[PDB]
Design a protein around this nucleic acid. Sequence first.
RNA 1: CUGGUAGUUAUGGCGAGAAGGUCACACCCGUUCCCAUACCGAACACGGUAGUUAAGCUUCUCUGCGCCAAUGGUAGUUGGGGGCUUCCCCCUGCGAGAGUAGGUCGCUGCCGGG
RNA 2: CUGGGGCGGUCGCCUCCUAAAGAGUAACGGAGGCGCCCAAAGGUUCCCUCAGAAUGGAUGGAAAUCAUUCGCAGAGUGUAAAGGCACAAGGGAGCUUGACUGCGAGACUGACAAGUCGAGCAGGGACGAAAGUCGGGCUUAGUGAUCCGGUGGUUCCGCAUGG
RNA 3: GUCAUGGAGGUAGAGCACUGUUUGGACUAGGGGCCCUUCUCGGGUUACCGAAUUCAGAUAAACUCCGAAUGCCAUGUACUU
Lengths: 118, 175, 47, 133, 59, 73
Amino acid sequence: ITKIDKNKVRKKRHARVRSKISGTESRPRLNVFRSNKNIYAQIIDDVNGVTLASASNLDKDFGSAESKVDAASKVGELVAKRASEKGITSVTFDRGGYLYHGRVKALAEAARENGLEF
Amino acid sequence: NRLKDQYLKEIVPALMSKFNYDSVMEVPKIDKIVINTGVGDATANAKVLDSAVEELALITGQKPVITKAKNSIAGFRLREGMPIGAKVTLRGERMYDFLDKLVTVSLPRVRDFRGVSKKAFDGRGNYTLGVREQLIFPEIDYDQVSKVRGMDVVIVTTAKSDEESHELLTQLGMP
Amino acid sequence: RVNITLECTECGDRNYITTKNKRENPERIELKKYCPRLRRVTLHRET
Amino acid sequence: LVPKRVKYRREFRGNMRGRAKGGTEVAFGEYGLQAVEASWITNRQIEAARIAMTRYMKRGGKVWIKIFPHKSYTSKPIGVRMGKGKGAPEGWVSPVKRGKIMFEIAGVPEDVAREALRLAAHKLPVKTKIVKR
Amino acid sequence: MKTGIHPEYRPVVFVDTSTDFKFLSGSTKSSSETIKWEDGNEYPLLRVEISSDSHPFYT
Amino acid sequence: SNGRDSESKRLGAKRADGQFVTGGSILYRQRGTKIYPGTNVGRGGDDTLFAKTDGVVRFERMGRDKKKVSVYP
RNA sequence: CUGGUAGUUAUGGCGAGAAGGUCACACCCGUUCCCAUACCGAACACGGUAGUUAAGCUUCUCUGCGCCAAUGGUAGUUGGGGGCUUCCCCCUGCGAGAGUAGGUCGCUGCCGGG
RNA sequence: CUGGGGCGGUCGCCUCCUAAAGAGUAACGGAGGCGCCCAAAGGUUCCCUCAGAAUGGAUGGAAAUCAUUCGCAGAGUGUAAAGGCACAAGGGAGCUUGACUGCGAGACUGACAAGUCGAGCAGGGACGAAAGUCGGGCUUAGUGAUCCGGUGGUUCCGCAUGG
RNA sequence: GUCAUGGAGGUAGAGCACUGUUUGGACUAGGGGCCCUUCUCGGGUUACCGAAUUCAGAUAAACUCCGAAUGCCAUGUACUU
Ligand SMILES: [K+]
Ligand SMILES: [Mg+2]
Ligand SMILES: [Mg+2]
Ligand SMILES: [Mg+2]
Ligand SMILES: [Mg+2]
Ligand SMILES: [Mg+2]
Ligand SMILES: [Mg+2]
Ligand SMILES: [Mg+2]
Ligand SMILES: [Mg+2]
């Protein structure tokens, strides 16, 4: 028997999301990669192909947490913070193919609270 | 229970030294045990299916999902959809509670069984156990349901080569 | 299969025509359509 | 020789411009009968030519018929005005373009091959040339 | 694992009359009978038809 | 028993590559996506491709076997 | 150096072989909580990091499959002429498909950790 | 209408070939469909992948269901055919009625009558965390004018005035 | 009108990747001939058929992995008209 690769099928879902959601110079794409151990956020111009802001969990500059959902709320806080710094207001939220429920959600929720307009 | 722990104690190193694997991750482990019935006389009357959805629910532990026909043959008298046969899968600490039964209570009520029935392997590395009737098992008995129908039991393994599966089933307990 | 007219309860007119199969759906169909007289959504029911 | 079945019962006559796209080099036998000019070869002409080749060989050596009649042709009876739709299928033809090896033979000596093929060629409505591999 | 769908998954001991040995294996139909082995963790008991370990052919 | 045929549906390209079009100009009439909507182009309910804004029409390739029509202002 | 994320007609793919691993990535251990299965913690989700590079993952080699692909010639053909007109030939321009020499085990951008 | 007329056939719409690589293009030329269907077979969110073959398994047989491997589609797509479709337009499930009202820059098609597509604006919604999508259905048949009647509604007229 | 540049489009040709039509090998399944201890359950043969399978070779208005010449639609700050 063969074990299906989660990331391969993950990326096949991601494709389905990217179908309807592209980053513009006015409204970029808040892309979320999620690993078993930590989580990462990027804010991207798909017309040019350049990331403007990026938060993550394994950053020596602010990266203390209790639970992986709580941790992801802290990463969501920083990405939102660093986005406002750069001068980005309105973003579209790319799930990356993850179901909008546990972490990826709490990343979004916590980010939407700070200076971001989904 | 007493089998899964016994897999992690006296079946992981020794077996691996027989084939000589690199890591302990290739170690052929069992994934899922899939038991289906297939009631040919279901299209006419559905109460014989209900009895099939009752028996498996006392054998395994978890109710079976009813399987629906795929295409249409007129010979057997079948039409698109229509509930024909039930199926159930075991994974985790409920599955290694369905191999001990077969090691203890299933075999002796069968007449003969020449160790590992070599004829009943696919070759890709999975086993199918030929099951005559239901009275082999000890929960249901022949004093509840009218007719036996029958059963069909599959056991899926990580094993790549048939020989690397044959030398697993035995050591677990099942001849 | 027949032509159907949905009568609004308040609107007081039947401007929504539709169709159904009156064998599969013999009952009177209810749908929450926009009533342009009241300029809101109201339950419309088959006549 | 008849197609077992056909998608369409009626079909355009088509045209026979150009050298045959394939089957211009003897590929199975030693000797072949190559069409020099284009023509329709009816199944009745292919059979005539086949028996003429075969009888002269006396169940000796092989005969490949490299052309098959794929194309039906229709006719109108005598005393029928034009119109009222396409006529009924009559027979079957192979449009043979120039350079197409129609028959091939192996397993007999040159002289018998060359003789077999001239007998075959006299039943065909097309100018032929005997060619060898 | 869903709740209020399937029957019980409770553990239960199975014993043969001939060889007289005990082992834990979860299944349906408890019947509620006492055991000797593992007196702390009390489980049901069921009577079983002659087992494989007893029969010398399969053993 | 023959003799029938529908009206021809005047399908195919209605503006050229490199031609200035107004918003709403039909670019391509088609059954299905022979050509796919590009940037500033929309697909109508009958697969008609139309300019969402004024601009210049550009037919590009969109990956080996497929094709698309864009409108760049 | 590796994770993420784009671009680019597969020269990028598949297949085969090999090496590598807390720096991530991964499988892997668990089902108490959110959340799951038309049955199943397989998946999805959440909490762990004992165990391992075996697989995916990354890098390296290979032309077996695919893919890309000249030049030359030919078919066809716009225009202009001839014939012996089921068709054929000549002049001028354009010029395939197939086949072949050959090419390829990618190239390119941004972001984080190293 | 008609390779004289009659007899037979045909008469409107959709798909293909004829059609000569834009569009268009005839014949009593070659082939088929239509005069509907669907309360989901529509909208939206989320999730998914088919056919067939090999191999092993009780009633089970070549062929029912189950498991594994190989499988770019050899399946499916309500319904002909063509053009599409695996980011699926194909398959599940949850909630729904956008199968909305007022419209509509601008195009396509057309002798006319008609026919077709349409961003976007307003009202008020469905689904969605949002982005957004939704004015029926993968697309293209499923229809028939005017006149005259019938029913419903109506800050319209009402033959001196009120009716 | 020509030149230049861009583009839509599947014809000629060609090709067999699909769909149909088709020839000759080789290859096993099988069934039917042929003998048969046999219940034709199973063997041994076949060239009597056979459905796949590959190798070689053909073929198409309603086949296409391909694909011109022309024609068509545009654009130009080009030259004529
Ligand atoms: K002759
Ligand atoms: Mg026409
Ligand atoms: Mg529509
Ligand atoms: Mg007449
Ligand atoms: Mg006449
Ligand atoms: Mg045309
Ligand atoms: Mg009055
Ligand atoms: Mg041709
Ligand atoms: Mg053609």
